[PDB]
Amino acid sequence: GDDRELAILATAENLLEDRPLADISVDDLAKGAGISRPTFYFYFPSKEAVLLTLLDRVVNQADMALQTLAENPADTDRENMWRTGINVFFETFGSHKAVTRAGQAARATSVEVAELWSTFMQKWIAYTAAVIDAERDRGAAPRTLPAHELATALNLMNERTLFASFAGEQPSVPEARVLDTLVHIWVTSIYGE
Amino acid sequence: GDDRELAILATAENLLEDRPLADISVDDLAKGAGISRPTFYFYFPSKEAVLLTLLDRVVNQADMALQTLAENPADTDRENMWRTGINVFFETFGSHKAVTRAGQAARATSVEVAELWSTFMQKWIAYTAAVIDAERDRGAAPRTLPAHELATALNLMNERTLFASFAGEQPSVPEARVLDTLVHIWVTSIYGE
Numbered sequence: 001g002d003d004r005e006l007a008i009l010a011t012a013e014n015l016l017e018d019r020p021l022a023d024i025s026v027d028d029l030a031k032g033a034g035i036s037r038p039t040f041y042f043y044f045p046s047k048e049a050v051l052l053t054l055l056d057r058v059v060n061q062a063d064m065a066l067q068t069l070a071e072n073p074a075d076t077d078r079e080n081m082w083r084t085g086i087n088v089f090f091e092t093f094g095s096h097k098a099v100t101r102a103g104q105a106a107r108a109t110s111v112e113v114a115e116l117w118s119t120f121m122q123k124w125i126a127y128t129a130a131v132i133d134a135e136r137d138r139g140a141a142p143r144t145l146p147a148h149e150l151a152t153a154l155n156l157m158n159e160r161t162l163f164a165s166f167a168g169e170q171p172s173v174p175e176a177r178v179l180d181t182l183v184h185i186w187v188t189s190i191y192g193e
Numbered sequence: 194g195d196d197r198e199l200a201i202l203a204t205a206e207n208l209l210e211d212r213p214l215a216d217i218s219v220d221d222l223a224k225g226a227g228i229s230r231p232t233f234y235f236y237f238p239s240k241e242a243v244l245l246t247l248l249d250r251v252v253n254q255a256d257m258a259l260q261t262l263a264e265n266p267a268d269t270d271r272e273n274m275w276r277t278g279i280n281v282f283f284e285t286f287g288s289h290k291a292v293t294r295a296g297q298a299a300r301a302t303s304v305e306v307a308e309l310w311s312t313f314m315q316k317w318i319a320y321t322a323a324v325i326d327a328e329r330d331r332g333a334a335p336r337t338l339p340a341h342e343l344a345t346a347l348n349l350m351n352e353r354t355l356f357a358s359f360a361g362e363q364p365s366v367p368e369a370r371v372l373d374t375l376v377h378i379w380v381t382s383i384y385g386e
């Protein structure tokens with residue numbers, strides 16, 4: 001039951017490593033999961049819907065991991081606090097590069113994917129803003145930009161930069177340099193005048 | 194000759210304000226330019242090729258405007274130097290929102306568009322880096338990150354942030370706030386420790 005579903009999900013993720021959604025048939029998804037095409041259609045209405053669920057689970061994994069971090073303060077300086085946070089996204093999406101890459105393209109096409117991404121981005125920006133605001137209240141950050149606007153630009157940087165880097169786009173920050181790069185820009189822009 | 198070509202370009206830009214490339218036929222492009230479908234095919238192999246040229250001219254306009262700025266130093270502080278520069282991109286792409294939005298989608302699909310964007314981004318990052326390096330040499334900026342990596346992340350921020358803002362995406366920086374937002378993050382990240 002759940003097992004066939006899990007196998008369709010895993011077959012899909014596997015197949016997205018080597019080629020795009022376009023050049024993957026539900027036929028390929030069925031065989032890989034060891035089921036018929038009709039049986040596939042019982043678990044998912046489409047191949048697009050397989051991607052969506054896959055993306056859903058990556059996004060929830062990131063979020064949950066961020067919630068875990070937020071609940072257990074790490075005994076460290078401001079720079080490592082931010083780093084530890086950004087690293088959740090770096091590791092989680094970096095561990096699911098094929099889904100990441102396919103998700104982001106599907107944003108153009110699928111309203112569900114666009115809305116899924118949109119919902120979580122807003123949540124992560126709201127959280128970034130609350131932390132900046134909290135840093136301003138304790139007197140550790142200067143009151144420069146509207147915290148929420150700053151959080152927005154910083155989150156959008158991370159999205160574009162993390163993903164160009166995982167795709168190996170030209171141009172991009174080398175994947176082994178991208179954490180330090182993003183952390184420097186977060187902390188200088190959050191704490192600097 | 195050039196006039197029919199110009200009219201196809203303008204018809205296309207006009208039509209992209211109200212709907213995507215997908216829901217624009219070459220038929221619509223021909224009528225709008227006041228020509229036949231066959232005559233259209235003499236000037237352009239496809240509707241995709243119309244977008245590409247349109248994007249080409251926006252991108253060259255931005256570049257040329259940046260070259261003009263680079264050739265005439267403005268008598269001003271570091272913050273306004275960066276602002277004046279980022280503003281070239283804000284105004285130029287912000288004046289061609291339909292082409293911008295369609296260009297960026299076509300990146301997924303068209304290898305020409307992807308390469309066009311890629312070429313110019315590299316050029317703009319190289320230039321940003323040369324300016325950061327020049328600021329480090331005169332002793333106005335600290336030697337923090339690899340200048341080229343910093344330039345890369347900052348350029349990618351601007352691309353994602355400018356465009357989310359012009360599209361009116363959720364989330365985004367309001368278009369009337371996005372200049373100040375980006376300038377703060379450039380200058381704090383370039384000059385800060």
Ligand SMILES: CC1CCN(C(=O)NCc2ccco2)CC1
Nearest residue numbers: 085086089124128155158159162
């Ligand atoms: C405190 C956290 C909040 C979120 N964040 C971050 O990179 N979000 C942007 C993103 C999502 C997927 C790729 O990039 C790190 C800092």
Ligand SMILES: CC1CCN(C(=O)NCc2ccco2)CC1
Nearest residue numbers: 278279282317321348351352355
């Ligand atoms: C000195 C310049 C260099 C380029 N730049 C910039 O925003 N480039 C990124 C971009 C292109 C299109 C949208 O965003 C402003 C600063």
